[PDB]
């Protein structure tokens with residue numbers, strides 16, 4: 001009990017510093033401490049009850065600065081603190097957590113599209129590089145299932161991708177997996193039960209409402225019910241057995257919609273609206289602030 005969906009940063013006209021938290025139990029939103037630096041294209045994750053904001057870019061009227069930053073938010077204090085920075089700036093990053101370590105995957109730095117991957121150790125406040133992916137990927141979806149790390153889709157600098165790959169930590173090795181049925185950059189990627197889900201994104205032509213899921217045992221991708229809204233650069237998380245998608249861009253509007261997927265019924269429902277439309281947010285779940 002007492003867990004909230006946190007949304008950090010984002011983009012609307014410029015990169016945003018907002019930290020807002022939604023309570024699925026009562027529908028309430030709270031505005032919390034702003035990020036020290038506005039960022040879009042970042043990822044959020046939680047280790048040990050602390051919320052981490054990783055990477056991104058500060059788009060402002062006075063510049064565009066890709067971020068190598070790792071910042072941690074403590075809900076007990078409602079304060080952000082800087083952590084050790086990554087080896088490189090990574091905009092449109094993907095992040096996953098394995099056994100208390102944060103993996104930062106891909107992303108861009110100017111015209112560079114990274115294949116590099118690095119791993120954060122909160123106990124030592126240190127980053128170290130690990131094996132790079134087989135493909136350069138920005139706007140990559142990342143999720144962790146059964147202590148394996150998946151990198152899904154993205155953009156390699158020339159083509160948007162339907163390919164995906166899996167990292168095996170004990171061998172420090174990446175292997176390709178079955179590609180998705182759809183090309184997707186800027187999808188929301190998460191894990192629910194035994195599947196990796198890829199929701200929305202941009203196929204090079206249109207923003208997508210389709211959603212597909214990879215069963216790690218059968219190695220197949222299967223479509224599920226589509227979202228109500230086409231969305232790229234959406235936020236995504238899982239909470240109490242349901243997927244939540246937040247915001248994004250539908251080709252016309254920066255969305256304030258939040259939709260919830262129920263796997264038992266294979267349906268999406270609109271559950272709330274953010275306080276303003278935005279894309280490129282980082283999202284994660286942790287305890288409510290004190």
Ligand SMILES: O=C(O)C[C@H](c1ccc2c(c1)OCCO2)c1ccc2ccc(OCC(=O)NC3CCCCC3)cc2c1
Pocket residue numbers: 010011040041042092138139140154155160185186187202232233249279280281
């Ligand atoms: O395919 C690609 O080139 C990369 C891809 C991408 C680029 C251009 C697009 C697009 C998708 O769809 C709409 C058409 O223009 C991508 C993917 C993930 C992102 C994640 C965060 C993020 O943060 C900052 C952010 O929201 N900016 C938005 C500006 C207004 C709409 C697009 C993103 C950006 C991401 C961008």
